[PDB]
Every structure is written in C-alpha cells, then in structure tokens.
Structure 1
C-alpha cells in the first residue's frame, strides 16, 4: 500500500520549510521541524491528514466540510495553492499518485 504516512510527513516538512508561519496555527507551534515526529500534537494532526487522503481516494471525503473548517482557522485559497505545490513534491518524492484533483476539490469551496 502507498505509504501515505511518509508522504504526509514530507508534505509537512515542505510546507513549513516554505511557510514557517503556517506552523503557528497548530498545536505544535514552535517545535523544530526535525522533532515533529516526536510531538504528540503533530502525530494526531498528521494522522488526520493521512485519513483525509485515504478518504479522498476512497470516495468519502467531504471537501466542502474540510474547506469550511480551514476558513474557520483563517486559512484560504492562497495557502491551499501553496499546499498543493508542497504535496505534489511529497508525492513525487515517494513515487505516489499526485493528489492535485483532491486539492482542487477543496479549492473549489475556497
């Protein structure tokens, strides 16, 4: 099975390396990037992201709901376009299918 947990870890590394300030919105604010894997708040968040990916592939993802929750944290289209790029890099690094269509689905509600 595609190692989505590893893809997601690389995704967050790319995302926070390019936009360190995005990390301030999470429960692992301030934590060194090389230590995220040892952080409980991060472990939970990464698990939810992996779940969302498996839901998008499986056909049950609620893109509208995910978009609305992100708007609820003041996260919008710009951030998601940046995330789309970071996730494409993470997928490519693992020879995983690209998730651009799934991100476009979320973007369609932002």
Structure 2
C-alpha cells in the first residue's frame, strides 16, 4: 500500500522549511524539524492528515468542512497553494500519485 505516512512526513518537512511561520499555528510550535517525529502533537496531526488523504482517495473527504476549519485558523487559499506545491514534491519523492485534485477540491471552498 502507498506509504502515505512517509509522504505526509516529507510534506510537512517541505511545508515548514519553506514557511516556518506556519508551524506556529500548531501544538508543535517551536520544535526542530528533525524532532517532529518525536513530538506527540505532531504525531496526532500527521495522522489526521494521512486520514484526510485516504478519505480523499476513498471518496469520503469533506473538502468543504476541511476548508472551513482552516479558515477558522486564518489559513486560506494562499497557504493551500503553497501546500499544494509542497505535497506535489512529497508525492513525487515517494513515487506516489499526485494529490493536486484533492487540494483543488479544498481550494474550491477557500
């Protein structure tokens, strides 16, 4: 099965390398990138991200709900376009299918 957990870890490395300030919105604010895997707040968030990806592939993702929740953290279209780029890099690094359509689905509600 596609190792989405590893893809998601690479995604967040890419995301926070390019936009370190995004990390401030999370419960693992301040934590060195090389330590995220040892952080409990990160483990939970990465698991939810993997779940969302499996839901988008499986046909049950609530893109409108996810978008609304990100607006509720003042995260919008700009951040998601950055995320789309980072996730495309992470997918390609693992020979995984691209998730651009799923991110487009979220973007359509932002």
Q: TM-score range by the shorter chain?
A: over 0.9
1:10, CA displacement in angstroms?
A: 0.0
How far apart in 1 are the matches of 2:88 and 2:41?
24
How far apart in 1 are the matches of 2:41 and 2:105?
26
Number of aligned residue pairs: give it. Answer: 110
* Structure 1: gaps (5+ residues): none
Task: Tell me the equivalent position of 1:44.
Answer: 44
* Structure 2: gaps (5+ residues): none
User: Normalization by structure 2: what TM-score?
Assistant: 1.00
1:40, CA displacement in angstroms?
A: 0.1
What CA RMSD, in Å, does the superposition of the two structures yield over aligned residues? 0.1
1:52, CA displacement in angstroms?
A: 0.0
SS in 2 for 1:10: helix
1:48, CA displacement in angstroms?
A: 0.0
How far apart in 2 are the matches of 1:66 and 1:21?
21
Task: Tell me the equivalent position of 2:31.
Answer: 31
1:4, CA displacement in angstroms?
A: 0.1
SS in 1 for 2:2: coil
4+ residue segments displaced more than 3 Å: none
How far apart in 1 are the matches of 2:105 and 2:97?
16
